[PDB]
């Protein structure tokens, strides 16, 4: 019982570094590129409307 | 450094979903964890006795 | 039997206001209709304030 | 006066307006509705009128002032309450007697019914006057005393006549200054283009702190007089606390607070509990108001005014710097007048930049920012005043995808950084220590290093202690508590003191209301050296259970010293102070 | 009153410049008003009103209701009636069904005025702005006990597409009270099924007799969907300051509203801002809720329940943005909520009364309200959180005080926010409720309480 919870610990704290330093890291900074395009298509949207 | 989707209305909405979701699952693992080395310590002590 | 009695207390109520309110209107019909016939019949002879 | 010609919107097209310039306020139709002019295309001018703008016919008379949009500088500024137009909420409401506000209310922004007391400078008939010279006194308050009068800093020439000593009202003569002939006529008051800054001879390098009275913000993130902070401001965070704090307990002798369009449930508890407030002075007990200007603005109130609240703001402490006197501004909901001036550009059509704020938001907080700063005053006598901008950044708190919150952040050098979390963990005054900052200690290390020099080398060790405690933390969290060593328990040890004593002041309380910047440094000094002896009995070998049962009675002393109170003050707290250090030795030392 | 007794002659023009999709554009205008309600003459003899959106030389470019549909350029009079628009303000406005543009729907004669009021109404003035003190008890326990509205405050409820905001909001209409009052209902492009739901639920329950409805369908025009929050506000500002009752003025739909702002703002060559919503929504939306509030020398407050709708369910929306920022507080509808089938399917968690405080008092409501609403919050998030924890750690492993918890959860969801929509669950009630709910679990675990609250009633 000692070995088994001791590889499922390991692989659970592997999943939740992983987690907190890739996954959440990277969907961050998608959320924030995708704003960032959406905002830059709402710019050229809003120049077209203007000429 | 992030994914390489294509920039979308409908598709932002899925990312902060997937964002939320995987805040959920860093959470409840992260519960697991502590839960689980709980009871590694209380069984490396009844190893030890 | 008291849906019809609670309506008959309403217009009990009721009357009363209609009797006043009849009294009232006749009592200052004179007034009243004197008021709007002197505002109808003189109007106010001015231009415009921006003419 | 001109005459309407197109109303489409809040933007107004007036025909017929040779002479008019740009920036202008205008008295738009019948009822006398105050717009600026935003464009001339010959006769025509175009109008943003500042209230509503229904029912402007056409041929409507539009008057020209002749000036920008100005402030009314004068005294009888003190008690008052403004907008961001500056017009007086507490007069219009005794004027209209109703709860609104109406459309084209034209009530002074300063009392001229009231009369002033007038006593002249030492500017003498036929001495040459210069803009910003005192030519005269007025006593308008109990804490503020001697309203020094001030010639317009743009006026020059040679005085003609002098008012003498008497009683005086605003709208009657008090200088006849002549320049190349008598064109120049001043009364107690005069008027100043909100948009530019009031001229000054020199601006100086902010040194002497702003001392808040608390013990956080006046030792790790202190603030210099003149200096320009930044808070979250966000909703149950202490913003209240700090706002009151600024107003009653710091060296500033006059206080500007600006709403700029926070909420009027909101603008209602500022309005009912500033009142409310008493600065303990030298004479007596006389409220906080008698040295605070409101600008109070809603989000009702007009885009227009609650742009133009903090350049209201700004431009009344940049006149009460003119006078030598130090001012601090607090700015609640600087996003908000950033959201204000979007919907200005986007009402004038200019394109975004970023997040839809207008291409010119950046250099607007600059400039705004760049108007604080201690600064000599224009003229003779060479007086010196300071003008200390304190801005809550957003109701996104401290959220850097605002380009409003980015840019205060930004130009800003102090940030306190309120935490939401340490509030609902009834941690008082709420500030964040591990993300608060401030770009001032190495400019206050000059009047440190002359009043009290080991201020800054105990503040870099708190704030050592607290990173390691941060560390430690970390590790006890990751790991068992007891595998720390001795090292490690003492700091954490430490840091939980400092937190509870130090750090968490109780404002409401009556010993720990205003900590002076004297009792700060003793219990800092304090602090340090109970975590120094800490440590030397560490080094020692000693246990460390056994030293924190034989120095409870230290850690009880120490934890004191939030509870000895400053009302003796000087000596007379700062000797007891003498023997606690020495029994924080005697006692670690046995 | 006495300039009332006036006859001001109206000017028809039968010069019509052109018409471009709802704007009519007329020629030779003597001196246009801005902002000048204006009845149009179709050529088939159908009167129509319009609002003037522009003005300039002799020009005005009117804006008809209902469209544009059959005007003629030879022979559509257009007469200008040289005034805003007004509403007859009345006492006898309590108990009348109004539509978009204040016209009587109900089967009842016009108001009988007692003044003619400018629906757009003027700023309050901020020194006259006093802090909300006492709290409107609403029958949802929900949110009188643990989001109470103070009177004066300004708390959207914020649901989604499908959520019963609309059953919410005539709960509250049916239900509200002081811990005199009139309730002032405006109903924007709603359903013809919803808004004859909102007549037939007052006229039934007899909530009618203290409600001034404002019922504005969805195919109604959009210009008189942009006035109904103005005719509410405006009766409610009536009612309260110059008659001295509270009033919880309930808007419905904000975001059918902002979509008709949308639609006006477009009428215009003005460009579209964040989302195609103007700029200026914001000062719009500010207008429309700051409205309310308490002042100082009348004994009368108004409260707001703007019951807003999300689009897409993103607190990111611009609606929702901006709405939060003028107000004071939040509460939350639930997707998931509805879905389990809980009414109201209030979310606790998100939501919040930011006058909390004030409402939940010793004088006003009783002595433990703050406290019990404070713990309830605790355990509920602790409740949600052995929820997720026990399909991950198993139900055995969790602790005594999360077992405990999700049984209090299941008394929670099940009894306390489960609300039938015609119980009127008063504040003391729902409290009494929340302390049986509390008594699950030992007087050591409820941690939030005081102490001497604790000894007093559990």
């Known amino acids: 019982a000692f070995i088994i919870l001791d590889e499922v610990i390991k692989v659970t704290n592997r999943r939740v570094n992983a987690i907190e330093h890739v996954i959440i890291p990277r969907t961050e900074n998608t959320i924030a590129y995708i704003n960032s395009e959406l905002d830059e298509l709402d710019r050229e949207e809003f120049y077209r409307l203007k000429k | 450094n992030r994914e390489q989707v294509f920039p979308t209305r409908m598709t932002l909405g899925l990312m902060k979903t997937k964002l939320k979701g995987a805040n959920q699952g860093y959470s409840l693992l992260k519960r697991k964890s502590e839960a689980l080395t709980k009871r590694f310590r209380d069984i490396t002590k009844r190893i030890d006795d | 039997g008291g849906v019809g009695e609670l309506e008959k207390k309403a217009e009990a109520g009721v009357q009363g206001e209609l009797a006043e309110i009849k009294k009232i209107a006749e009592k200052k019909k004179d007034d009243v209709v004197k008021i709007l016939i002197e505002t109808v019949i003189k109007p106010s002879a001015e231009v415009h304030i921006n003419a | 006066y001109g005459a309407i010609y197109s109303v489409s919107g809040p933007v107004v097209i007036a025909e017929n307006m040779i002479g008019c310039a740009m920036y202008e306020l205008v008295k738009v139709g019948h009822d006398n509705l105050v717009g600026e002019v935003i464009r001339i295309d010959g006769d025509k001018a175009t109008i943003q009128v500042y209230e509503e703008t229904a029912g402007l016919t056409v041929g409507d008379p539009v008057l020209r002032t002749g000036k920008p949009l100005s402030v009314e500088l004068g005294p009888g500024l003190m008690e008052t309450i403004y907008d961001g137009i500056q017009r007086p909420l507490k007069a219009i409401k005794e004027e209209s007697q109703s709860i609104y506000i109406p459309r084209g209310i034209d009530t002074p922004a300063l009392d001229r019914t009231i009369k002033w007391q007038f006593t002249p400078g030492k500017f003498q008939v036929g001495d040459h006057i210069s803009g910003g010279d005192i030519y005269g006194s007025v006593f308008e308050n109990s804490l503020i005393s001697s309203h020094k009068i001030l010639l317009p800093p743009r006026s020059r020439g040679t005085i003609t006549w002098i008012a003498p000593a008497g009683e005086y009202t605003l709208d009657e003569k008090i200088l006849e200054v002549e320049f190349d002939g008598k064109k120049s006529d001043f009364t107690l008051y005069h008027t100043w283009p909100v948009r530019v800054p009031r001229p000054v001879t020199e601006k100086l390098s902010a040194d002497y702190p702003l001392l808040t009275g608390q013990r956080v913000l006046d030792a790790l993130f202190p603030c210099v007089q003149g200096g320009t902070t930044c808070i979250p401001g966000a909703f149950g965070c202490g913003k209240t606390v700090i706002s009151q704090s600024l107003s009653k307990y710091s060296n500033s002798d006059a206080i500007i607070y600006v709403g700029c369009g926070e909420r009027g449930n909101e603008m209602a508890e500022v309005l009912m509990e500033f009142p409310e407030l008493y600065t303990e002075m030298s004479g007596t007990k006389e409220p906080i108001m008698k040295r605070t200007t409101l600008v109070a603005n809603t989000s009702n109130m007009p885009v227009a005014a609650r742009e133009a609240s903090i350049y209201t703001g700004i431009t009344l402490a940049e006149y009460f710097r003119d006078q030598g006197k130090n001012v601090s501004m607090i700015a609640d909901s600087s996003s908000r007048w950033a959201e204000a001036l979007r919907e200005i550009s986007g009402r004038l059509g200019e394109m975004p930049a970023d997040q839809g704020f207008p291409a010119y938001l950046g250099a607007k907080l600059a400039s705004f920012y760049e108007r604080a700063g201690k600064a000599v005053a224009l003229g003779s006598p060479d007086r010196t005043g300071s003008v200390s901008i304190v801005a809550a950044v957003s109701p996104a708190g401290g959220d850097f995808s605002d380009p409003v919150t980015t840019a205060t952040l930004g130009i800003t050098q102090v940030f306190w950084g309120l935490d939401k979390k340490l509030a609902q963990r009834k941690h008082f005054p709420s500030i964040n220590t591990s993300v608060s900052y401030s770009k001032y200690t190495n400019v206050l290390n000059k009047f440190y290093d002359s009043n009290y020099p080991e201020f800054p080398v105990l503040r870099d060790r708190m704030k050592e202690i607290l990173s390691n405690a941060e560390e430690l933390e970390q590790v006890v969290q990751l790991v068992g508590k007891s595998a720390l060593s001795d090292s490690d328990k003492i700091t954490l040890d430490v840091a939980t003191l400092i937190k509870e004593d130090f750090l968490q002041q109780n404002g409401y309380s009556t010993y720990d209301a205003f900590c002076p910047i004297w009792k700060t440094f003793d219990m800092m000094r304090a602090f340090i050296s109970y975590h120094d002896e800490a440590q030397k009995a560490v080094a020692n070998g000693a246990n460390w259970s056994k030293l924190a049962d034989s120095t409870g009675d230290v850690k009880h002393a120490v934890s004191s010293s939030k509870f000895f109170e400053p009302s003796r003050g000087e000596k007379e707290v700062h000797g007891e102070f003498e023997k606690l250090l020495s029994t924080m030795q005697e006692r670690f030392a046995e | ?433 929340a302390w049986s709910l509390l008594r699950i679990y030992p007087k050591e675990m409820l941690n939030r309480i005081s102490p001497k609250i604790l000894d007093e009633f559990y």
């Open chain 5, 1 to 433: 009153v006495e300039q009332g007794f006036n006859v001001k002659p109206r000017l028809n023009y039968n010069t019509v410049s052109g018409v471009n999709g709802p704007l009519v554009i007329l020629e030779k205008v003597k001196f246009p008003r801005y902002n000048e309600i204006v009845n149009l003459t179709l050529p088939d003899g159908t009167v129509r009103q319009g609002q003037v959106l522009e003005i300039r030389g002799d020009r005005a470019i009117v804006q008809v209701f209902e469209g544009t549909s059959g005007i003629d350029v030879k022979k559509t009079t257009v007469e200008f009636t040289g005034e805003s628009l007004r509403i007859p303000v009345s006492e006898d406005m309590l108990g009348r069904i109004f539509d978009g543009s204040g016209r009587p729907i109900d089967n009842g004669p016009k108001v009988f005025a007692e003044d003619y009021l400018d629906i757009n109404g003027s700023p309050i003035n901020p020194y006259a702005r006093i802090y909300p003190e006492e709290m409107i008890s609403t029958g949802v326990s929900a949110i009188d006990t643990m989001n109470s509205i103070a009177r004066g405050q300004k708390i959207p409820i914020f649901s989604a597409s499908g959520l019963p905001h609309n059953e919410i909001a005539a709960q509250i209409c049916r239900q509200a009270g002081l811990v005199n009052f009139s309730i002032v209902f405006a109903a924007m492009g709603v359903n013809l099924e919803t808004a004859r739901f909102f007549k037939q639920d007052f006229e039934e329950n007899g909530s009618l007799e203290r409600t001034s409805l404002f019922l504005n369908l969805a195919n109604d025009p959009t210009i008189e969907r942009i006035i109904t929050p103005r005719l509410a506000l405006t009766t409610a500002e009536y009612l309260a300051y110059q008659t001295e009752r509270h009033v919880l003025t309930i808007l419905t739909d904000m975001s059918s509203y902002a979509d008709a702002l949308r639609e006006v703002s477009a009428a215009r060559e003005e460009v579209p801002g964040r989302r195609g919503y103007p700029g200026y929504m914001y000062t719009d939306l500010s207008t429309i809720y700051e409205r309310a509030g308490r002042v100082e020398g009348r004994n009368g407050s108004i409260t707001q329940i703007p019951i807003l709708t999300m689009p897409n369910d993103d607190i990111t929306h611009p609606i929702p943005d901006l709405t939060g920022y003028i107000t004071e507080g939040q509460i939350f509808v639930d997707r998931q909520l509805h879905n389990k089938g809980i009414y109201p399917p209030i979310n606790v968690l998100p939501s919040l009364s930011r006058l909390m405080k004030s409402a939940i008092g010793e004088g006003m409501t009783r002595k433990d309200h703050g406290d019990v609403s404070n713990q309830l919050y605790a355990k509920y998030a602790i409740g949600k959180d052995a929820a997720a924890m026990k399909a991950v750690v198993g139900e055995e492993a969790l602790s005594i005080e999360d077992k405990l918890s999700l049984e209090f959860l299941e008394k929670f969801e099940k009894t306390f926010i489960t609300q039938g929509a015609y119980e009127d669950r008063t504040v003391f009630e729902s409290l009494d409720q």
